[PDB]
Structure 1
Amino acid sequence: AQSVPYGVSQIKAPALHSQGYCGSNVKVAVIDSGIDSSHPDLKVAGGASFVPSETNPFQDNNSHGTHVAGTVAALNNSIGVLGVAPCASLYAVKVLGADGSGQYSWIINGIEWAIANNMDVINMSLGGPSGSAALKAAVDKAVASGVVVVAAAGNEGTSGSSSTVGYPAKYPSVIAVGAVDSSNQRASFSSVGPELDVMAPGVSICSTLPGNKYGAKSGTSMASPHVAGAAALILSKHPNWTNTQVRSSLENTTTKLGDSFYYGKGLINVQAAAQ
């Protein structure tokens, strides 16, 4: 039997699925630890590895990339779970090793690859406390080229009155995603600041794991792919919308929560965003 993870329903994805909108022909790049292409509930279309010691993008020695990928696009069938955009074309852009860390050079290499390969949506469930001109240039180039760039906000919680949003989420060109639970309450770990854009489910998220498994994980890493998948749904309904239009629609139709420093614009609603 297939289960629908709470988070998928919470952002109102199933409403679109019912209409026949599931992200078909939308190219989504998961820039992370790779995706287990052998998982029966996923379909990987392609990708690349930029980790020097782990040349196969289709082997996830961490489990993080695979989990993120399932939130985006676990297949609509009779097993496992269901992704926000189950018909999307999924790409494994491996920039993180087995330990879940990776060099900036590798990440930037992955964004450059995504732009050159005409990805529609980029998901980056990763972050560092420091930026670089090259990192900023790459995300800006992607947006300038019409790509929707989504990133996790960070898991740093609160710190007095300062922003704890990480990079590249901190850049204006990137959509920065914080995490809520099933009751719409902000997760205590979710990073905060004026650079936070939207919220999505991020606590105890069930998704795919390598080796034909499924398990829950919590983090802004789990929130981001709900927004990435939401963008893919929008593009499947309005293929001529620009990245700017997708972004504005997502931000403009949220369910408002508390203060924007903690919740950004609020919780995404893909049904409202899709018009």
Structure 2
Amino acid sequence: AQSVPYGVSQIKAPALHSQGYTGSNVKVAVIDSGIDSSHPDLKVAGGASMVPSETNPFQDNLLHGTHVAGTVAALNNSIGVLGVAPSASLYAVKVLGADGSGQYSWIINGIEWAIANNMDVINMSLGGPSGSAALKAAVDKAVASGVVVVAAAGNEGTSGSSSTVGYPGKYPSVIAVGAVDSSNQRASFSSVGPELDVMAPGVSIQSTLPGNKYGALFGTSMASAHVAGAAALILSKHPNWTNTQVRSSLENTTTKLGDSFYYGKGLINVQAAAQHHHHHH
């Protein structure tokens, strides 16, 4: 039996599935620890590993990219879970090594790979605590090329009056996604700051794990996965919307929650987003 993790319903994905909007022919790069392509509830279209020691992007050593991938696009069938965009074309972009880290250069390599291979949506369920002009150039170039660029806001919680949003989440060109729970309360770990754009489910998120497994993870990574999947649903109904139109559709149709510094625009509503972009007109 297939379970639809609550987060998928909480963002109103199923209303769009019933209308025939499932992310078909939308290319989503999961820029992360890779994706297990042997998983019965995931169909991996392609991808690349930018990790020196790790030539296979379909070998997920961190059990992270696979979980992100399953929130984006777990298949609609009689097993496992269900993705926000279950028909999306899923790309494994491995930029995190088995040791648990990656260089920004490997992230930029993934971003450049994603532009060159015509990804519609980049999800970066990862980040670091400091900026680089190079990383900003790279996400700015992705946005200039018409890619919808989604990143996890970071898991740094509150730090007095300061933005704790990670990079590349912090860059204006990137959609920075924070984490709420099933009550639409901000998760205590969710990074805060004026760079926060939207919230999505980020606590106790059931998804696919390597070796035909499922499990719950928490983090702004899980939240970003919902938003990247949401972007794919939107583009499967409005394929000519610009990345700016897709971003505005999500930001301008949210369920308003608390202060913008903690919740940005609030919880995404992909059903409302898919009606209209609300960019200018």
Q: Tell me which interval the TM-score lies in, with the shorter structure as reference length.
A: over 0.9
TM-score between both structures, scaled by the size of structure 2: 0.97
Question: Which aligned segments of 4 or more residues in structure 1 are displaced greater than 2 angstroms?
Answer: none
The CA deviation string for residues 22-58 of structure 1, in whole angstroms up to 9 with x for no partner, is 0000000000000000000000000100101000001
Aligned to 1:46: 46
The CA deviation string for residues 204-224 of structure 1, in whole angstroms up to 9 with x for no partner, is 000000000000001101100
**Do the aligned partners of 1:4 and 1:82 also contact (CA within 8 Å) in 2?**
yes
Structure 1 residue 105 displacement after superposition: 1.1
Structure 1 residue 15 displacement after superposition: 0.3
Partner Cα separation in structure 1 for residue 133 and residue 265 of structure 2: 27
**Do the aligned partners of 1:197 and 1:264 also contact (CA within 8 Å) in 2?**
yes
Partner Cα separation in structure 2 for residue 45 and residue 257 of structure 1: 36
The CA deviation string for residues 154-211 of structure 1, in whole angstroms up to 9 with x for no partner, is 0000011000000000000000000000000000000000000000000000000000
Q: Secondary structure at the match of 1:197?
A: strand
Structure 1 residue 104 displacement after superposition: 1.2
Structure 1 residue 148 displacement after superposition: 0.1
Structure 1 residue 227 displacement after superposition: 0.2
Aligned to 1:257: 257
Partner Cα separation in structure 1 for residue 234 and residue 92 of structure 2: 21
Q: Secondary structure at the match of 1:108?
A: helix
Structure 1 residue 97 displacement after superposition: 1.1
After TM superposition, the structure 1 stretch with the greater mean CA deviation from structure 2, 96-105 or 83-92, is 96-105
Corresponding pairs, count: 275
Q: Secondary structure at the match of 2:90?
A: strand
Aligned to 1:22: 22
Structure 1 residue 131 displacement after superposition: 1.1
Partner Cα separation in structure 2 for residue 240 and residue 222 of structure 1: 27
Partner Cα separation in structure 1 for residue 145 and residue 104 of structure 2: 21
Partner Cα separation in structure 1 for residue 78 and residue 265 of structure 2: 35
Aligned to 2:129: 129
Structure 1 residue 130 displacement after superposition: 0.8
TM-score between both structures, scaled by the size of structure 1: 0.99
Partner Cα separation in structure 1 for residue 226 and residue 49 of structure 2: 23
Aligned to 1:193: 193
Partner Cα separation in structure 1 for residue 19 and residue 151 of structure 2: 28
Partner Cα separation in structure 2 for residue 104 and residue 23 of structure 1: 29
> What RMSD, in angstroms, separates the aligned Cα atoms of the two structures?
0.5
Structure 1 residue 133 displacement after superposition: 1.3
Partner Cα separation in structure 1 for residue 239 and residue 219 of structure 2: 31
Partner Cα separation in structure 2 for residue 273 and residue 215 of structure 1: 29
Partner Cα separation in structure 1 for residue 99 and residue 87 of structure 2: 30
